[PDB]
Design a protein around this motif. Structure first.
Motif, PDB file in Angstrom:
ATOM      1  N   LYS A 396       0.818  -1.202   0.000  1.00 26.90           N
ATOM      2  CA  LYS A 396       0.000   0.000   0.000  1.00 26.90           C
ATOM      3  C   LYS A 396       0.855   1.257   0.000  1.00 26.90           C
ATOM      4  O   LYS A 396       0.527   2.228  -0.686  1.00 26.90           O
ATOM      5  CB  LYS A 396      -0.936  -0.012   1.203  1.00 26.90           C
ATOM      6  CG  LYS A 396      -2.251  -0.697   0.948  1.00 26.90           C
ATOM      7  CD  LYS A 396      -3.233  -0.396   2.053  1.00 26.90           C
ATOM      8  CE  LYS A 396      -4.593  -0.057   1.493  1.00 26.90           C
ATOM      9  NZ  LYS A 396      -4.779  -0.603   0.123  1.00 26.90           N
ATOM     10  N   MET A 397       1.953   1.264   0.758  1.00 28.04           N
ATOM     11  CA  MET A 397       2.819   2.437   0.776  1.00 28.04           C
ATOM     12  C   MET A 397       3.427   2.691  -0.596  1.00 28.04           C
ATOM     13  O   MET A 397       3.422   3.828  -1.096  1.00 28.04           O
ATOM     14  CB  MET A 397       3.909   2.260   1.830  1.00 28.04           C
ATOM     15  CG  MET A 397       4.867   3.423   1.933  1.00 28.04           C
ATOM     16  SD  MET A 397       6.352   2.999   2.847  1.00 28.04           S
ATOM     17  CE  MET A 397       7.368   2.323   1.540  1.00 28.04           C
ATOM     18  N   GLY A 400       0.709   3.916  -2.996  1.00 28.67           N
ATOM     19  CA  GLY A 400       0.291   5.272  -2.702  1.00 28.67           C
ATOM     20  C   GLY A 400       1.288   6.303  -3.183  1.00 28.67           C
ATOM     21  O   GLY A 400       0.911   7.309  -3.791  1.00 28.67           O
ATOM     22  N   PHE A 401       2.575   6.066  -2.932  1.00 27.64           N
ATOM     23  CA  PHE A 401       3.577   7.014  -3.401  1.00 27.64           C
ATOM     24  C   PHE A 401       3.627   7.062  -4.924  1.00 27.64           C
ATOM     25  O   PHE A 401       3.772   8.143  -5.517  1.00 27.64           O
ATOM     26  CB  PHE A 401       4.938   6.666  -2.809  1.00 27.64           C
ATOM     27  CG  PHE A 401       5.135   7.198  -1.424  1.00 27.64           C
ATOM     28  CD1 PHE A 401       5.177   8.556  -1.195  1.00 27.64           C
ATOM     29  CD2 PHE A 401       5.260   6.341  -0.350  1.00 27.64           C
ATOM     30  CE1 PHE A 401       5.353   9.048   0.073  1.00 27.64           C
ATOM     31  CE2 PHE A 401       5.436   6.830   0.919  1.00 27.64           C
ATOM     32  CZ  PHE A 401       5.482   8.184   1.130  1.00 27.64           C
ATOM     33  N   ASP A 403       1.106   6.535  -7.012  1.00 27.55           N
ATOM     34  CA  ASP A 403      -0.049   7.299  -7.475  1.00 27.55           C
ATOM     35  C   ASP A 403       0.134   8.791  -7.233  1.00 27.55           C
ATOM     36  O   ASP A 403      -0.224   9.614  -8.087  1.00 27.55           O
ATOM     37  CB  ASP A 403      -1.328   6.803  -6.804  1.00 27.55           C
ATOM     38  CG  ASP A 403      -1.748   5.431  -7.286  1.00 27.55           C
ATOM     39  OD1 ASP A 403      -2.177   5.319  -8.452  1.00 27.55           O
ATOM     40  OD2 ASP A 403      -1.681   4.467  -6.497  1.00 27.55           O
ATOM     41  N   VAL A 404       0.694   9.160  -6.080  1.00 31.34           N
ATOM     42  CA  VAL A 404       0.895  10.576  -5.778  1.00 31.34           C
ATOM     43  C   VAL A 404       1.818  11.212  -6.810  1.00 31.34           C
ATOM     44  O   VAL A 404       1.534  12.291  -7.349  1.00 31.34           O
ATOM     45  CB  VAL A 404       1.438  10.744  -4.348  1.00 31.34           C
ATOM     46  CG1 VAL A 404       1.996  12.135  -4.154  1.00 31.34           C
ATOM     47  CG2 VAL A 404       0.351  10.470  -3.337  1.00 31.34           C
TER      48      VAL A 404
END
Ligand SMILES: CC(=O)N[C@H]1[C@H]([C@H](O)[C@H](O)CO)O[C@@](O[C@@H]2[C@@H](O)[C@H](O)O[C@H](CO)[C@@H]2O)(C(=O)O)C[C@@H]1O
Ligand SMILES: CC(=O)N[C@H]1[C@H]([C@H](O)[C@H](O)CO)O[C@@](O[C@@H]2[C@@H](O)[C@H](O)O[C@H](CO)[C@@H]2O)(C(=O)O)C[C@@H]1O
Ligand SMILES: *[C@@H]1O[C@H](CO)[C@@H](O[C@@H]2O[C@H](CO)[C@@H](O)[C@H](O)[C@H]2NC(C)=O)[C@H](O)[C@H]1NC(C)=O
Ligand SMILES: *[C@@H]1O[C@H](CO)[C@@H](O[C@@H]2O[C@H](CO)[C@@H](O)[C@H](O)[C@H]2NC(C)=O)[C@H](O)[C@H]1NC(C)=O
Ligand SMILES: *[C@@H]1O[C@H](CO)[C@@H](O[C@@H]2O[C@H](CO)[C@@H](O)[C@H](O)[C@H]2NC(C)=O)[C@H](O)[C@H]1NC(C)=O
Ligand SMILES: CC(=O)N[C@H]1[C@H]([C@H](O)[C@H](O)CO)O[C@@](O)(C(=O)O)C[C@@H]1O
Ligand SMILES: *[C@@H]1O[C@H](CO)[C@@H](O)[C@H](O)[C@H]1NC(C)=O
Ligand SMILES: *[C@@H]1O[C@H](CO)[C@@H](O)[C@H](O)[C@H]1NC(C)=O
Ligand SMILES: *[C@@H]1O[C@H](CO)[C@@H](O)[C@H](O)[C@H]1NC(C)=O
Ligand SMILES: *[C@@H]1O[C@H](CO)[C@@H](O)[C@H](O)[C@H]1NC(C)=O
Ligand SMILES: *[C@@H]1O[C@H](CO)[C@@H](O)[C@H](O)[C@H]1NC(C)=O
Ligand SMILES: *[C@@H]1O[C@H](CO)[C@@H](O)[C@H](O)[C@H]1NC(C)=O
Ligand SMILES: *[C@@H]1O[C@H](CO)[C@@H](O)[C@H](O)[C@H]1NC(C)=O
Lengths: 484, 489, 485
Positions: A396-397, A400-401, A403-404
């Protein structure tokens, strides 16, 4: 005399995106994403990788009989391992802190095998044990780098062994314990009950008791082997003591090189190339600052963005005066200053605003590329069966990074494109406004973009206009004369 | 009779950065980043920290004889520790769940030592044992807060000990088990083989067995001591029972204050100040909303951005006239406002500055600055954590998370400042052009524009009429016939 | 004869925010945030959730006498659990790797109890053991899904049991060990000391020694029970062997459906609805792309933004020619061409730039919705007492991603609002400038945003002016003659 202001037009067919508009044709476009790879697993800076084949890391380190080509291994750049290797633990069992060992190996280059406990010192035991689960040409065998200690006659004297790390660097040592499936096998292999295995260094201290239980036959055997490891520092000592159930090591793995490396989960085979960075699907040969092939890469090469298009519009709108469209004739610069006198016409371009616009656009491109060097790089990691929460956290980390940063890149490209198009339109309008301002009321505004001079003047006058040196007091009386 | 419109220029030399241009000089700029500190470790709101010095946390809690100045410590605000403390476990061994204990201590203020099991109740055992590893003045000694039980004569009866937590808060209890280096040592110290140490509470159930092994000599000994801990709830009971190898506790640590604190890894010494927040390199005493000293801070002070410069343009551009309007540059005479409206009548002149647009622009710029500051108060704050040798994956995860969030927020702050500067400069240019366009619009056609940014009236007006033009009450029908007659010439 | 240029005004009272000014009144606005729920817990796509009531997951799986209504359980969509359940482990003890089991259950629908080791095969032991910690109607009882083997007569023969998983899917097996408080109790219960409990599979090998110690009394007992679990693969066998202190299983749990689910910590009960998205506070029924109710959500429904208001400015500034303000009497479109000929007047609105502005605004709205559909979604997780660092890491990561995405959305909306208002003003100004440029000198710019023609021309000429087909060489002579007067 006519002086029309316009913008250069051409025949390119490159399309860009924008917040308000989509699929807009521009003159010059710079692509920032590479989407191609050669699909070959091959060398990094001339150092070939380590190809385990059908082998696991545990099988390589313990010395599986099938994996006999890895007994001596030269320097490497990365490690290629299959997702589900077939030749792993020849004898069924487990490896304690396997994933931590893999993490440690990920940053470790060339090893160096050192014979730390020869097989001839165990004079009071038998060192010729083996199992059919690890068979060569039908006969029983065993791991190449480890020794199985067994009865000699009918006694099992206490086994002792020590090593003082005088090699020169840190060393990794692997030892094991054996778990039979009945008391009869324990008595027929070691002639003792309630045995123990003791390992002690300046930091580590264990005493393991063998565990006996009935288990299903995996690879034909009902027994298991439990393997542990430690890292031995310089001038440190490791001690072994066992009344039974000891699988002693014969070699320690000196750490020789160190550096930046990794472990790749691929099903391919080594070929002959030379690349600068490598992905699990293929190599990348590029100079662009982005790619969209695979997040996990080894080497030095672009950042990863999960996007299909990243095009930066460095030119002008492609619409073929400046109220009607562009000019195909001009080839010099970007902003138009059409020449048309009595003695001849022309298509001269402006050298003043063009240089400023080029400098600004190049600054914007460089700033866009520069703002993204601090991106997030993913690093491979392995997790066990009882660590699913940690695996989910890591996944997930990373997602998430990713996608950001993808969002950031796409938004920046869109906003910069819109600013660029509006910037060019404003520059042309400002040039026209400056011309109309400087010339003042000594002309008529035709409407399409240029002025019909109210006063007859010549090459010198209008190149004076172009240089921004037109003088109203110099020539106005004849203008008023022809005004009637 | 001639009005003009321009803007204000001055002597400032502050430089600001923009998405398209670099190193642009402006009139007024506001700094947001802070790059200085006093370089001293000192008090937080009047409460001094707990300076361990050469001691570790385990050495402080267990009672290392070198850490005898910490037997009774007052209330603290943060803990000062070295990267590799010299005085930790004098007798070699381990400490189970050390990092969890440190995480708990990072939010615990003042302790309180309570004698839960006095040394004198062990009337059937020997409690004077000690080792030369923890030696004072050459003679053997031991941990100040623990008891080493050995045999008395030739017998080691079963040792029991209980405590019911009636102290009024939660308590921390630490015990241990000794691992000898042969069977002879075990028989010489405890006169039993196959011993055990059992600890039981309402939520804890343990039974440890000694592990005898051959090991090298650390600080002169081949044996090791393993220490464990638990948190006793209020009104709870802890039971001890051992046949041998028990290092029993004498004191229990009672949590008294609680609050917000931390463990800071530093190599400096305490000095005299009074700061609002503290970093491992020094202290900050300012009011700016950003800083770039060190990511880990204790107290209340700005957020961390990994940037070298962060300046916001809250002013005009500075391109003054070389050697009378906005087509050439700014005027030095406008000291009253931001947007100049220079006037010149037949009887006099002046450099009056407009008010309606200046106040609106000031309010807008102030709102923009406040919005930029307010949008970044939800940043990411780093919290210190410690990890063991066999937890490298977790340490890498934590490090990557903190670094990634810092990079994201640094990118956000830098991009926001760049875009703000661009739009502010364009705003000022557009506002000057808008004022000029309004003047030309109201003027209609009763003037011939000189081009340099202003027009000379065709109609001869006076101070009152031109003041009205300034205010925005220019009447075409009142004064058009004389203007037409004059323009006929 | 004169035309005019302006925009559309009305009586809406919607307020938007901008980076340069706050609380601006606009004509048309669109909301993107949902801030309402019905406060009820109810069915997801027609499948009711599993209501544990006052029971924990361990109590349901081990068969607590109080949780006797969950012996048979149908398909579910999510699990309802309380923060501090009452009926958990009736006999005091511990559960090894509880949080990993909960994570596994987080994506598992319908189970199926399989009787793997019946209670009647233990013909050499007493299976009727029980405790007063789990007491029904006063008399002692035990867990319904487990068997307590004690001595029979005066002997405890070695207890063996095996099961081969031919059920057709992965099966969950739970076993336990018993820790008495004294040697006398162990001798009374099992007649042997130094006993062991051994469990063996193709990937699990364990040998547990009972730990005897003195402990306080929890639920009236000083003993403890430790439970462990494993997942059995298909066509794999499990072996049990013990000399004492064995709490044997009787039922296995076959994973039958699988899917997407979750565990929700709530205190409410089950009402009647048919919702598509559920939050611990209540259900959500909306088509907007964002919400601000609760970070944790089960189902398919909008993303979470930690904000209070998110409004996108679609229309024009609502202040009542184009210089003095907007027009209240225009109803056709956005940008108008209010005309007044010799024989009449009107309030016509342009149809060319209006479509371009509408397309641009719709594209912007769709783009803003589209870029923000790759947000971060939080997933519930549980941690134990000695896992505080991991819990803090997870909480900080989720909070950080939430703040990052909230900041992104807010900044996008503010910048888009500024750009939209500036776009509308620039479009109106461009329309006026193009008309003035086309009219050339045949105009007397009054100032109020519109002018009076210098040539008298009829409705067709005015229409031609509005349509861009204004001809200078058509009626310039009479205009010049008039202007010479
Ligand atoms: C009750 C007690 O503390 N007894 C010893 C202690 C233990 O016998 C043992 O060393 C546990 O680690 O150890 C101390 O004593 C000794 C030295 O003085 C001697 O030179 O060497 C001994 C080992 O061969 C032993 O170390 C010690 O730790 O120094 C102290 C005490 O007498
Ligand atoms: C086979 C069995 O379940 N036997 C007892 C059981 C055990 O003897 C032991 O308590 C394990 O925890 O315990 C139960 O019995 C007793 C009480 O009725 C009595 O007042 O106190 C006993 C302890 O001193 C014991 O607890 C119980 O748990 O209540 C039940 C059963 O008889
Ligand atoms: C391992 O070997 C090293 C060197 O071979 C030993 O270190 C030496 O110890 C002797 C003690 O008699 C000293 O006199 C030397 O000065 C030491 N040499 C160095 C380089 O430090 C070390 O003691 C050995 N380890 C053990 C456990 O005996
Ligand atoms: C620890 O001490 C407390 C009191 O200091 C004990 O709690 C009392 O227990 C008796 C039982 O005989 C009750 O009658 C009292 O009402 C209790 N008092 C309070 C304040 O709860 C507690 O039982 C002790 N712990 C143990 C294990 O005995
Ligand atoms: C568990 O049951 C399965 C199914 O009966 C067993 O698998 C069979 O093993 C026999 C060996 O005698 C083969 O002849 C069959 O073909 C197998 N069946 C299938 C479907 O593969 C399995 O051996 C049993 N487990 C144990 C440990 O005996
Ligand atoms: C010392 C030793 O390796 N002994 C024998 C082992 C063990 O007795 C157990 O079987 C554990 O595998 O097993 C074999 O019989 C076997 O067929 O695998 C080979 C060998 O003769
Ligand atoms: C270009 O993008 C637009 C989106 O506005 C789409 O409608 C059109 O089909 C696209 N054209 C091509 C050739 O992809
Ligand atoms: C990479 O691409 C360049 C093209 O610019 C080519 O010259 C070079 O040979 C390529 N590298 C390899 C290893 O083929
Ligand atoms: C610029 O001018 C101001 C006038 O107020 C003066 O105070 C300042 O010292 C000057 N700066 C320099 C560098 O001369
Ligand atoms: C200002 O920035 C420009 C970047 O274009 C750089 O070339 C110049 O050296 C800078 N000046 C100073 C004093 O740093
Ligand atoms: C902080 O700095 C200010 C100067 O602005 C000074 O007046 C104040 O005394 C300082 N505070 C401390 C605690 O040193
Ligand atoms: C609108 O926002 C402004 C902030 O600039 C605030 O002062 C005002 O009270 C708000 N009005 C309403 C009705 O919320
Ligand atoms: C959700 O709201 C809509 C309103 O558009 C309504 O038609 C629908 O019935 C609602 N759903 C439920 C389950 O009440």
């Amino acid at each position: 005399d006519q002086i029309c202001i316009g913008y250069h037009s051409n025949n390119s067919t490159e399309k860009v995106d924008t917040i308000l508009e989509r699929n807009v044709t521009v003159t010059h476009a710079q692509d920032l994403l590479e989407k191609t790879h050669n699909g070959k697993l091959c060398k990094l800076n001339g150092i070939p990788p380590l190809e385990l084949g059908d082998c696991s890391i545990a099988g390589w380190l313990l010395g599986n009989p099938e994996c006999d080509r890895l007994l001596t291994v030269p320097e490497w750049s990365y490690i290629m391992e299959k997702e589900n290797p077939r030749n792993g633990l020849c004898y069924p069992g487990s490896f304690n802190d396997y994933e931590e060992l893999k993490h440690l190996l990920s940053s470790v280059t060339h090893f160096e095998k050192v014979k730390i406990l020869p097989k001839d010192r165990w004079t009071q035991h038998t060192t010729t044990g083996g199992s059919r689960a690890c068979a060569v040409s039908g006969n029983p065998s065993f791991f190449r780098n480890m020794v199985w200690l067994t009865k000699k006659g009918s006694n099992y004297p206490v086994a002792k062994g020590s090593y003082n790390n005088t090699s020169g660097e840190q060393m990794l040592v692997i030892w094991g314990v054996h778990h039979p499936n009945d008391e009869a096998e324990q008595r027929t292999l070691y002639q003792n009950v309630g045995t123990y295995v003791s390992v002690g260094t300046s930091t580590v201290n264990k005493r393991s008791i063998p565990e006996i239980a009935t288990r299903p036959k995996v690879n034909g055997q009902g027994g298991r082997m439990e393997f542990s490891w430690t890292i031995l520092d310089m001038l440190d000592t490791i001690n072994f003591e066992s009344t039974g159930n000891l699988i002693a090591p014969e070699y320690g793995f000196k750490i020789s090189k160190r550096g930046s490396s990794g472990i790749m989960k691929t099903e391919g085979t080594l070929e002959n190339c030379e690349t600068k960075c490598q992905t699990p699907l293929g190599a990348i040969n590029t100079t662009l600052p982005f790619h969209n092939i695979h997040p996990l890469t080894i080497g030095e090469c672009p950042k990863y963005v999960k996007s299909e298009k990243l095009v930066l519009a460095t030119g002008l709108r492609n619409v073929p005066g400046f109220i009607e469209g562009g000019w195909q004739g001009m080839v010099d610069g970007w902003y138009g200053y059409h020449h048309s006198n009595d003695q001849g016409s022309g298509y001269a371009a402006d050298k003043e605003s063009t240089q400023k616009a080029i400098d600004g656009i190049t600054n914007k491109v460089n700033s866009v590329i520069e703002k993204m060097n601090t991106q997030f790089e993913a690093v491979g990691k392995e997790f066990s069966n009882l660590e699913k929460r940690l695996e989910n956290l890591n996944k997930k980390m990373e997602d998430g990074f990713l996608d950001v940063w993808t969002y950031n890149a796409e938004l920046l490209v869109l906003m910069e494109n819109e600013r660029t198009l509006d910037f060019h339109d404003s520059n042309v309008k400002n040039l026209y406004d400056k011309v109309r301002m400087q010339l003042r009321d000594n002309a008529k505004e035709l409407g399409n973009g240029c002025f019909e001079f109210y006063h007859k003047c010549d090459d010198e006058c209008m190149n004076s206009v172009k240089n921004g040196t037109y003088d109203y007091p110099k020539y106005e009386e004849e203008s008023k004369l022809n005004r009637n």
